[PDB]
């Protein structure tokens, strides 16, 4: 009876933490894109060659 | 004289990169 | 005078390498 309640407590925490990781993923992809395309705009210390190469 | 203007350009580019990141974080 | 321009070239190359790694990490 104790293990059959521990098993339910594990299953519900599993289904909640999977959705929180699935939202963490999408919030983290946008941070990678922000950092990359914001750092690539600093290739104006050279000409447009330095812009396309960034 | 080429080495000194390349050294000053490197220091200027480092300062410009820091200022760009500082303004962009705001 | 050769020793001083080699010393300045070494210091300039060190600064350029640091600036390259700093921009590439961004």
Curated annotation (Swiss-Prot), chains B, C:
Induction entry: During anaerobic growth. Weakly or not expressed in most strains. It is activated by SlyA, while it is silenced by H-NS. Its expression is also regulated by CRP and FNR.
- Domain of life assignment: Bacteria
PTM note: In outer membrane vesicles, the redox status prevents formation of the disulfide bond, leading to oligomerization and pore formation.
- Cellular localization per UniProt: Secreted; Periplasm; Host cell membrane
| Primary role | Toxin, which has some hemolytic activity towards mammalian cells. Acts by forming a pore-like structure upon contact with mammalian cells.
How would you summarize the oligomeric state and partners of this protein? Monomer and oligomer. In periplasm, it is present as a monomer, while in outer membrane vesicles, it oligomerizes to form a pore structure that is active. The pore is formed by a dodecamer.
Report the sequence similarity comment from the record: Belongs to the hemolysin E family.
Protein name per the record:
Hemolysin E, chromosomal
């Amino acid at each position: 009876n104790n293990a059959s309640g521990k098993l339910l407590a594990l299953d519900s925490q599993l289904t909640n933490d999977f959705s929180e990781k699935s939202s963490y993923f999408q919030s983290q992809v946008d941070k990678i894109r922000k950092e990359a395309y914001a750092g690539a705009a600093a290739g104006v210390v050279a000409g447009p060659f330095g812009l396309i190469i960034s | 004289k080429t080495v000194e203007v390349v050294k000053n350009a490197i220091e200027t580019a480092d300062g410009a990169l820091d200022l760009y990141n500082k303004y962009l974080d705001q």
